[PDB]
Design a protein around this ligand. Structure first.
Ligand SMILES: O=P(O)(O)OC[C@@H]1O[C@@H](O)[C@H](O)[C@H](O)[C@H]1O
Lengths: 620, 33
């Protein structure tokens, strides 16, 4: 389909690009995966002219960085001068899929120059940094060393090439500000993945999404003592040849907060080849989740397991940001509706959110051991029955069915039966809370009244611990378990881009998101009639909370009323949707951003035609 | 004025209604572009 070499035929000649980011070869956040995935295609387009600028960490260099010698004499002399001037910079490869060249800068080896660098920064842009941040000083040092390295590289080259600088986050924006300050012949691109004040204002302040035009950012930066971070972020955003954002919602957020409309939007992608390794895997995962729910619900298995649906929500433990309260309230409403209608369907909800636990509870382990004992007894009895039937059937005689069970088989069956006796109800959580009184999820469940009762048609399972293949009760990784679920509900409120819903959708599981996330807006914009492809968008921007909850309840009820053939068709449609989120297509927006940057920086040599051409209308 | 404003910068008391507002940084920065 649409490859990188479609329509951007451009004279690249002697051009070098720097992918400056604070997290390269240092796993801190989530856009680490974005850089790791984009590196392969970007380097394939760029050949050997792709560099990454980032801080040095002993752990990172020990685990995934292989030190090497730089291939050009210019890098040799720049590194020699850089080490001989009182700093400490190393060179090597990044041990990832693409294997790009990396320069690592040790911010701890330049503490002597912070006093003069702060003064120069203030004399250049009137930016001050308080002494107690311990993070902004690191950003300032990283920017100073980055701009000094760029200046030395351009100055010491016999022939000056076209250098492109690309920064990603406000810990690196000081470098962009300084390189623009010193009038270096460089093309600067600034891309933001999350507004700094967005996270601060969403928590505490109410109706942050209904008051964008009524926010005078200066004060809100003032009272929180994050004024200087916003100052450098906004300054770096302003003095950029090309300004870029990751999603539309963040685009409006930056426009109303950073006071600059982003020129191009660049969604985050991923490599679909590794995830693709498609119904056998889902069937196996569903069967083993059936095994798990049989283990947990021993002694209360009064509902058909062929008409049960599995819902799940995952991510970091943010009750409000992920909208778990909305999901719980809508689950209660759906339980009420199903109980009224007298339906045979059952909904089992999973909640994978980290919490502060110590160990498992006795009930879950007891149930799992009981299930294992029942399975073993059934296997032993069925093996004996099969052997007896085979031997009695070779002699051409009908099996006398009343004599295939003897004393010890009855003893084992009886032991199993008394093992499956229980008077209480299955627990709603599989661990022991250390803050059970202050837990919001459990408090909400208690308020809405879901205790896995016999009459309840909706079951709630809370699994705080990270999902691992070595777990005593769920020995499975995140990917395989997600593959088997029926639907993924993410009623998020504030999220610049949804990594988890993207992973769910690329997997081929129908998902529910909001118009309030980058993924939701991307899907809504790039396809028509999204409901047919297994994606349901919750309108949260132009609606109240009760409206958002009723709509989500209606979506869930509509999903629960679908027949098996309808579910199969919807699942096939969502299967044939993974290629929209791969870097093979999403990498073109970054390339267009680069072309804009070169056109702005060197209009004499480069000229760009503003082509914004780039699709899935319908299937029924 | 200059030195005392610089001090208020490191100790972090910014008069963001007036001289320490981002507008001054804007009019200083816009000359370089
Ligand atoms: O016979 P083909 O045209 O090669 O198609 C065979 C395809 O191989 C793999 O891609 C998957 O197993 C597909 O589910 C299957 O349809």
């Amino acid at each position: 389909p649409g490859l990188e070499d479609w329509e951007d035929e451009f004279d690249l000649e002697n051009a070098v690009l720097f992918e400056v980011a604070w997290e390269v070869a240092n796993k801190v956040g989530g856009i680490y995966t974005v850089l790791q995935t984009k590196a392969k295609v970007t380097g394939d387009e760029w050949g050997d002219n792709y560099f990454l600028v980032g801080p040095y960490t002993e752990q990172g260099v020990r685990t995934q960085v292989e030190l090497l010698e730089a291939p050009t004499p210019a890098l040799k002399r720049t590194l020699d001068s850089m080490n001989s001037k009182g700093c400490k910079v190393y060179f090597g490869r990044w041990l990832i899929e693409g294997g790009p060249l990396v320069v690592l800068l040790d911010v701890g080896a330049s503490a002597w120059a912070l006093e003069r660098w702060k003064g120069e920064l203030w004399d250049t842009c009137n930016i001050g940094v308080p002494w107690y941040d311990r993070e902004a000083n690191d950003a300032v040092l990283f920017g100073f060393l980055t701009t000094w390295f760029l200046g030395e590289f351009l100055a010491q080259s016999e022939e000056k090439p076209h250098v492109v600088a690309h920064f990603h986050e406000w810990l690196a924006g000081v470098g962009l500000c300084l390189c623009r300050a010193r009038r270096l012949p460089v093309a600067t691109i600034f891309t933001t993945h999350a507004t700094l004040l967005g996270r601060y204002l969403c928590a505490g302040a109410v109706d942050f999404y209904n008051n964008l035009e009524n926010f005078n950012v200066d004060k809100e930066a003032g009272e929180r003592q994050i004024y200087h971070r916003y100052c450098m972020e906004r300054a770096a955003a302003h003095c950029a040849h090309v300004f870029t954002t990751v999603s539309q919602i963040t685009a409006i957020e930056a426009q109303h907060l950073l006071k600059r409309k982003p020129d191009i939007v660049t969604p985050n992608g991923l490599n679909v080849k590794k995830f693709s390794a498609f119904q056998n895997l889902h069937a196996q995962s569903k069967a083993r989740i059936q095994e798990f729910v049989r283990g947990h619900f021993y002694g209360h298995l009064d509902f058909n397991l062929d008409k049960t649906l599995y819902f799940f929500i995952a991510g970091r433990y943010e009750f409000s940001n992920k909208g778990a309260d909305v999901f719980l309230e809508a689950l209660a409403r759906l339980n009420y509706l199903l109980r009224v209608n007298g339906s045979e369907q059952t909904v089992v909800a999973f909640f994978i959110m980290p919490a502060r636990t110590n160990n498992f509870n006795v009930e879950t382990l007891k149930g799992q051991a009981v299930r294992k004992q029942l399975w073993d007894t059934a296997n032993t009895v069925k093996e004996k029955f099969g052997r007896k039937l085979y031997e009695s059937l070779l002699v051409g005689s009908l099996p006398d069915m009343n004599k295939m069970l003897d004393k010890e088989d009855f003893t084992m069956m009886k032991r199993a039966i008394f093992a499956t006796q229980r008077q209480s109800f299955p627990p709603v959580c599989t661990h022991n809370m250390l803050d059970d009184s202050s837990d919001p999820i459990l408090t909400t469940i208690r308020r809405i009244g879901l205790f896995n009762s016999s009459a309840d048609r909706v079951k709630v399972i809370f699994h705080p611990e990270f999902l691992s293949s070595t777990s005593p009760l769920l020995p499975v990784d995140y990917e395989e378990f997600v593959r088997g679920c029926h639907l993924g509900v993410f009623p998020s409120y504030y999220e610049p881009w949804g990594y988890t819903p993207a992973e769910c959708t690329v997997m081929g599981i129908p998902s529910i998101s909001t118009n309030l996330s980058g993924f939701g807006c991307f899907m809504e914009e790039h396809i028509a009639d999204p409901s047919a492809y297994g994606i349901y968008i919750l309108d949260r921007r132009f609606r109240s909370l009760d409206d958002s909850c009723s709509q989500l309840t209606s979506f869930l009820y509509s999903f629960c009323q679908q027949s098996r053939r309808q579910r199969i068709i919807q699942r096939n449609r969502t299967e044939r949707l993974s290629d929209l989120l791969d870097w093979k297509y999403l990498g073109r927006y970054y390339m267009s951003a680069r072309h804009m940057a070169l056109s702005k920086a060197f209009p004499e040599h480069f000229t760009y035609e503003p082509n914004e051409a780039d699709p899935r209308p319908a299937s029924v | 004025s200059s030195e005392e404003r610089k001090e208020r910068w490191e100790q972090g008391q910014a008069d963001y209604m007036g001289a320490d507002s981002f507008d001054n940084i804007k009019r200083k920065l816009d000359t370089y572009l």
